[PDB]
Amino acid sequence: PTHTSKTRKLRGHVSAGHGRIGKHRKHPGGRGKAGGLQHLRSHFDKYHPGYFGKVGMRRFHLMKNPLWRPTVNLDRLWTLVPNETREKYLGKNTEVAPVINVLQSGYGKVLGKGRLPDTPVIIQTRYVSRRAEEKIKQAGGVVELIA
Amino acid sequence: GIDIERHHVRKSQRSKPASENVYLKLLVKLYRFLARRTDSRFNKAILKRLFQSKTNRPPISISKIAALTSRKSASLEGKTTVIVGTVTDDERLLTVPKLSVAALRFTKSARARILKAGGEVLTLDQLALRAPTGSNTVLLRGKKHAREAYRHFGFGPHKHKAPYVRSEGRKFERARGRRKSRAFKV
Amino acid sequence: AIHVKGQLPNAHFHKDWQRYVKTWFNQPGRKLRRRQARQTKAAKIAPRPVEAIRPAVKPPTIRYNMKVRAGRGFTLEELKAAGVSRRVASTIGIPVDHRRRNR
Amino acid sequence: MSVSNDLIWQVIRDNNRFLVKRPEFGGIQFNREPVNVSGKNAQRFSGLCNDKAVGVQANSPRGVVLITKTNPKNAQKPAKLFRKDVIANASSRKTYKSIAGRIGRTGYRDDLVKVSVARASAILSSQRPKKTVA
Amino acid sequence: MKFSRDVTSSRRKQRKAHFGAPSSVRRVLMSAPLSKELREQYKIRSLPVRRDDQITVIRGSNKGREGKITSVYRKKFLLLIERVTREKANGASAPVGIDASKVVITKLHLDKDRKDLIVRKGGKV
Amino acid sequence: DSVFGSTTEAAQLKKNYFLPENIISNADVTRLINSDEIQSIVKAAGPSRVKR
Amino acid sequence: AVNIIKKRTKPFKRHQSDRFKRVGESWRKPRGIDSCVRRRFRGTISMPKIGYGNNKKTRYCMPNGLKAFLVRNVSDVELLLMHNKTYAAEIAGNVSARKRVEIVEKARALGVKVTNAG
Amino acid sequence: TKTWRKWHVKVNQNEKRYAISSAVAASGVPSLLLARGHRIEEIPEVPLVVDD
């Protein structure tokens, strides 16, 4: 609020904190971010390297839906299943193994970070990393690919 | 005249919390007394951390607590873990061990999973009753420099820190000054 | 000029933007108007349902084809197989989508 | 059952109907609650906090009434929370002795015997006839 | 408390509507209580005053005086009562206006329309 | 209780809502400071006021 | 309330307020780049500073050792029942003549000194 | 002055519910009622509950 602002403290101080020598003039080094290559270079090159110039290919009319593929790691796979399903299968010996459909949890690829418990599980996913598939198979489970 | 040069004149530390939480004031009242009427460094540690800001009191999860108290050469088997801060859950830890934890706050998920595994959750005043000087306690802290700002602090030529950018991708600070093919690299 | 920490500024305010500022002080008023229109319409068409029945269709693209949502109207083949003439469908609140087909 | 007395003081130490605070003289505070014999704003003298507390009010036309708080089982029943004993028509020596007995010899608020006697003394001095000087 | 969306509690609007009221509206604004005997007889609490009505003054320096209403100065929201005057400098007597709310009617100037107004207002003749 | 729920039981009229927990279990800190478990391990009290 | 000393009894008037009617007497810190007063040249007026603060024991006390407590009604005077030797009652300017009599009477009953009696 | 000054303030739903929970809990405390100016010296019980 205005009552606690520094402006209230500067009443009676003639220059309002902006100096008597240099003052608070209108734009003395230009407007916006103009001058990054000339008189602002020492700032741009120190705090925003890479700013000027071109890198890489253009892609006309990018549409991000065909590229959609959020990822989940192995250490989160069992968290996608309800608590009742975990209690029924996790750590037990059952004829059936739970199905974890990662796509209905909002993921397009299963990645391999972390570890799995030693119970069989069926992982339904569009994509899977190589190391993720190896660790699923070591736990006795399988990856079945879907669309 | 006197020729005195004064550098460390005013102490730079907090003498009280910035928080207006009345219950935090009650905890400070308890630990002002305990840190004064005992010779325990534990109680002075708790009093000091009760003053600290949110960023200086990072959270810790029950996974980190379980890992820190279960080292091969630990002997931290049946001792109460204490953090002046929030204890979060780590859902990646599928099976939670039996833990005794004293904390300012517990997340609802953290508290439920600690109790369900047979452990116990205490507030810091309950801790003061059980271990008035912090004996046989594991005093723990979360990771101070895990927050986002520490990715950026110290950015400069060849410092390998993260820039402040509105967006990530090519066209966003990956050109002249960031690669050899564009003048120079960093 | 630029000397502080943070992102290089990007603000798109070089046109006469204050001329075309849109405020939302009428947001509760619009909400009340729309609810009153629904109540007025419901009493007028009663006992017909306020909403017509819609088909279930799969959204396009790989991002949403795992889901199901309401579509515009039933296909000519769907109406044929359910024994409903397309001219009769509208008279009893069944929308007809001549564009959608059953692949 | 109980909401803490420390917590109540934290809520009302700077905000209550019975506190008269002024900025003059560098910030003075007066407490006016009926069960505050000392009249000073502090946790130990506030009747709104303490389970056991006393107040000495004036009784018309003579004497004082001793106000005390009943056993904390009535903390949620304000009609049964306050006990008002009229110590009137007694002399000054008789009145102070009864206050000391009811508050101190019972172990109720032994810390508040001196202040209560002083407050009763001042009220009794205010009730005496005026020797108006024509 | 009011609840109608068609009622304004704006002080500005109420004052504008009162002081800007047209002649026929000011007639209802200048109403007086009926006397106790008249209230029971006609089952009516109050009426717009009228010339040739009989009143007694209930408030002010002229409290307790009685007389006919000689004129209803609606432009000033004032009643002129017979023999209620004051002396000018030159000896002439100037009538003193009294607010309609500050008198009580003790005898009505009954006539065809007034009789119709009593029955319409739920009263009796 | 159906409006607010409890700390461990969800409110029926507020989906997924639980009452907050406090950071101090017993707010009677004066009692704790003067309790047996505390007073039996503290050092000797020390002077509240000292002569000049 | 014993041996009340004032370090200064003059009020610290604003520089040049004696020369221009537009410049009020209330103290302002001179901030001019050439100000002789700010630089404390000999023979110029003094400026208020913390060294002039009075003894914490006797600060705010009137000459009689009491501090003038403002009272607007009888119940304000009743606040000074136990504090008879530290506070005097100052009756507010906007209190009516009737209420003022009742206040003077109540103070006399309690032995509270009234600064502005009459 | 402009109309597009920010007039309304958003509070997190959970904090709003926390605030109301605190306010209801305070209504159960006779000292806080008296401190807030309510003349409740004679009421039989706090919370005060009457028949339907």
Add this chain to the structure above:
RNA sequence: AAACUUUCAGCAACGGAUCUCUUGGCUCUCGCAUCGAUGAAGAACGCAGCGAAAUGCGAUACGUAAUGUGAAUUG
């Protein structure tokens, strides 16, 4: 010693600050869709017992018919 000049106070001037007020403004929201060759918007000139500016009106001229109210208008 006066006169004179200067400062302060009382009183008297000059001036219209201050305070209180407010049939006005500003802003928001809700609702509504109706100009004109059947001559509009705008302009001019006239009209009242005593009326120049405003309101109103048009040689039927601060208005005629019709409807409602029901004793005023008012300097």
Add this chain to the structure above:
RNA sequence: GAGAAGCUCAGACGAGUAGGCAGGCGUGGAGGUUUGUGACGAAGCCUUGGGCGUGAGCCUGGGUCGAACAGCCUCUAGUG
């Protein structure tokens, strides 16, 4: 007890423009509170009287006057 935001004992120290921070003073309006002030005189104003504060300022006697106005915790700004 000593507003634990309290109480108590001790030592050293004190220039300041530009500039930085803190704690305060004063103004319009909003919520809360104060059996708050007021036609038996609110607010405002004058003063050759009194008091308080290092200061911003505050309280008060006398005069004038005529309808409203203030303290305390918060909110807020077209606030000196």
Add this chain to the structure above:
RNA sequence: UUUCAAUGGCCCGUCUUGAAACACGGACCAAGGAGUCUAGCAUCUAUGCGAGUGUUUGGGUGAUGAAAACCCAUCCGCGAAAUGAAAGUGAAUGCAGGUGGGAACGCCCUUGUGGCGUGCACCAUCGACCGACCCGGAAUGGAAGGGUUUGAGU
């Protein structure tokens, strides 16, 4: 309070190395009179919740009286994964590693600024793991083996 005497006291504001200046503004008084609000960004603090978080695009109690309060679904934003121009690929040898300092705690001395054992945070450091790049390298795939390197990673 006024006045007198003695002693001291140049005209304020400003730009300036430097103003009493023969530098500029200022005859007088009242009232008005200048760091704001908005879209962002950054640090710091407080509060809520926390691997999540965000009821106010919307819809409902709703008609009573309702621009508030209060409630409610699906999306979506930001976060939970990086790297590469891209096609793509995508994070545990080990107690999620070793070394040094180190908070807190425990144990031994014997009155020392002690020794011993765990070791949070943080910093320095040696590795491992993912992506890019550079290698050899036994139609399509790049598995094991490597690298002085490289990334806003683990």
Add this chain to the structure above:
RNA sequence: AGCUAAAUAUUGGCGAGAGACCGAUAGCGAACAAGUAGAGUGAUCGAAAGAUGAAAAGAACUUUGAAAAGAGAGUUAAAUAGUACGUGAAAUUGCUGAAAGGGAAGCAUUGGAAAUCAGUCUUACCUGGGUGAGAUCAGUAGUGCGAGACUAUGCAC
């Protein structure tokens, strides 16, 4: 080649309800006979200006004056409200009083002189002394078992 409701817009117009807005140098330029008075050939430009009192009760009459007016009177709660009207600041001015003054004045420090202001003391509480009258006080008796406070019936006279 063609038509089409709704959900959308709305600083104009009309009608309505509000506001942590402004409060007569503010708020629209205009609270008032304001797009008026006034300026300019013209396009255009464009103000200032609210408040007696509850009610005119707006000062009869006498007197002095050529008159305007004055003085008596009168009305009013008030003329310290007289339309040049609520309050009525400052600059600026007259009168009266006080004081000072050899080519400025003002200020600071310290005292003199003169003027002016406050102490209300020794009140409270305690004891002693003189006389006086009086339902009379310590331990007890009885009415929640042990100990402690209180009131209440009597005795203690």
